[PDB]
Design a protein around this ligand. Structure first.
Ligand SMILES: Cc1cccc(C)c1NC(=O)Cn1nc(Cc2ccccc2)c2ccccc2c1=O
Ligand SMILES: Cc1cccc(C)c1NC(=O)Cn1nc(Cc2ccccc2)c2ccccc2c1=O
Ligand SMILES: Cc1cccc(C)c1NC(=O)Cn1nc(Cc2ccccc2)c2ccccc2c1=O
Ligand SMILES: Cc1cccc(C)c1NC(=O)Cn1nc(Cc2ccccc2)c2ccccc2c1=O
Ligand SMILES: Cc1cccc(C)c1NC(=O)Cn1nc(Cc2ccccc2)c2ccccc2c1=O
Lengths: 79, 79, 79, 79, 79, 86, 86, 86, 86, 86
């Protein structure tokens, strides 16, 4: 047997109130906040890559080799 | 046997109130907020890539190799 | 046997109120909010890619290799 | 047997209130906040990569070798 | 047997209130805050990489060798 | 006097505002005002006797959540002679 | 006098504002005002006797959450002769 | 007098503001005002006797959370003759 | 007199402000005002007798959290003759 | 007189401000004002007798957390004849 990333909960009682709960989070992006007030942005681009926004990426993969979650704002000229 | 990313909950009682719950989150993007107030943006682009918006990407894959979740704002000229 | 991303819940009682629930989230984009107030945007584009909007992408795939969830604002000139 | 990243909780009682809970977090990005007020940004780009935004990437992978979670703002010209 | 990164909790009682909880955090980025007020930024880029934003990357991998979590603001010209 | 001008351009925006007053705004926010959450009570053998004569009595397992804007929130009020003139 | 000008450009923005007053804003925030969370009570054999004559009594397991803006929040108030003139 | 100008440019921004007053803002923040969290009580054999005559009594397991803006928050108030003139 | 100018540039920003007043702002912050957290009480055999005549009594396990802005926060107040003239 | 200028550049920023007043700001900070944390009480056999006549009594296990801005925070106040003229 093999357990990986397993949340387990068990409870037992006779009389009363019993609560059992389990939660799991894998590759989760939570709570991203961004505020821009009275911001001046001047961009001149000639053949390049410019990123000024908000990017939130969450990736979960099984048996995946060589995977890329995020690739933001790049110039690639491989030969 | 093999368990991966498994949420398990068990409860037992005789008299009363019993609550059992299980939750699972894999590759989940939650709670993204963005505010732009009185913002000035001037962009001049000639053959490039400019990104100024909001991007939220969530990807879950099984047996997937070489997968890319997000690729934002790039210039690719591979030969 | 093999379990992956499985939410399990079990409950037992004799007299009273019993609640059993299970939830699963895979590749889910939840809660994206964006506000733009009194925002000035001037864009001049000549043969390029400009992105200023809101993008929310959720992808779930099984046995998929080389899959791309989102590709936003790019210039591709592969030979 | 083998346990890795496992959260386990067990409780037992006869009369009263009993609460059992388990939580797991793997590759989770939580609580990112950014504020820009009265900020001036002037960017001139010629064939390069400029990144000025907010990037939040969370990646969880199993049996994945050579994986890259985030690659932001780079110029690649491999031969 | 082998245990690695395992949180375990057990409780027993007869009468009263009993609470049992377990939490696990692996590769988690939590609580990142950034404020820029009245900031002036002037950038001139010619074929390089400039990064001025906020980057938060969290990666959890199992059986993954040679993995890179974050690679921000680099110029690569390998032959 | 508030003046905004833009002349001899390709793309031009000119905005002029005399007086401006912003308002309250919520974006992806959660609020909880007067909320009762997660109350558990277990009783086996309770003997309760109440003898009330012209009064307010609150007895037993009580869970009250109140949210008032322009009024008063009370649970038990045994008063008398409440008058408002003009 | 507030003047903003922009002449002989390709992209130009000119904004002029006399008086400005910002407001309150929430972005991805959580608030809890008057919140009761996680109350557990266990009682086996409780004997309770109440004799109330013209008063306010609060008895037993009580969980009260109150949020008031322009009023008073009370649990037990045994008063008399409340008057507001004009 | 507030003047902002920008002439003979390619990209130009000119903003002029006479008076400005910022406001309160929350970004990814949590607030707790008047919050009761995690109260556990165990009682086996409690004998309680209350004899109230024209008063306010609060008895037993009580959990009260109050948040008031322009009012008073009280638990037990046994007063009399409350008057507001004009 | 406040003047800001920018001439003969490629990218130019000119901002002029007469009077400015910043506000309060929270970024990724937590606040706790009037919070009761983690109260545990165990009682086996408690005998309690209360005889109240025109007063305020608070008895037993009590957990009170209060947050007031423009008012008074009291637990037990046995007063009389409260008047506000004009 | 406040003047800021920038001439004959490639990238130029000119800002002029007459009067400026900064505000309070929190970044990744935690605050605790009037907080009760971690109170444990164990009682086996307690005998309590209270005889109150026109007064305020607080009895037993009490946990009070108060946060007031423009008011008074009291636990037990047995007063009389409170008047505010004009
Ligand atoms: C809660 C409670 C219980 C028993 C004894 C008392 C004194 C209180 N407290 C209050 O009534 C506080 N109050 N007073 C007034 C003014 C007023 C009160 C009574 C009669 C005439 C005028 C009021 C007016 C408009 C909207 C709200 C309110 C408010 O909330
Ligand atoms: C809570 C309580 C219980 C028993 C005894 C007392 C004194 C109090 N405290 C208060 O009533 C505080 N108060 N007073 C006034 C003014 C007022 C009160 C009574 C009658 C006429 C005017 C008031 C007016 C408008 C909105 C709120 C309020 C408020 O909240
Ligand atoms: C809590 C309590 C219990 C019993 C005895 C007392 C004195 C107090 N304390 C207060 O009532 C404090 N107070 N007073 C006033 C003024 C006022 C009070 C009574 C009658 C007429 C005017 C008030 C007005 C408007 C909104 C709030 C308030 C407030 O909060
Ligand atoms: C808490 C308490 C219990 C019993 C005895 C006392 C003296 C106190 N203390 C206070 O009432 C303090 N106070 N006073 C006043 C002024 C005022 C009070 C009573 C009647 C008329 C005016 C007040 C006005 C507006 C908002 C708050 C308040 C406040 O908070
Ligand atoms: C706590 C307490 C208990 C019993 C006896 C006393 C003296 C105190 N102390 C105070 O009331 C302190 N105080 N006083 C005043 C002024 C004032 C008080 C009563 C009546 C009329 C005016 C006040 C006004 C507005 C907001 C707060 C306050 C405040 O807090």
């Amino acid at each position: 047997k093999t357990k990986q990333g397993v949340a387990e909960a068990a409870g037992k009682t006779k009389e009363g109130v019993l609560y059992v709960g389990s939660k799991t989070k894998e590759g989760v992006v939570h709570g991203v906040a961004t505020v821009a007030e009275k911001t001046k942005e001047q961009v001149t681009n000639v053949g390049g890559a410019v990123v000024t926004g908000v990017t939130a990426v969450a990736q979960k993969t099984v048996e995946g080799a060589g995977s890329i979650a995020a690739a933001t704002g790049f110039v690639k000229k491989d030969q």
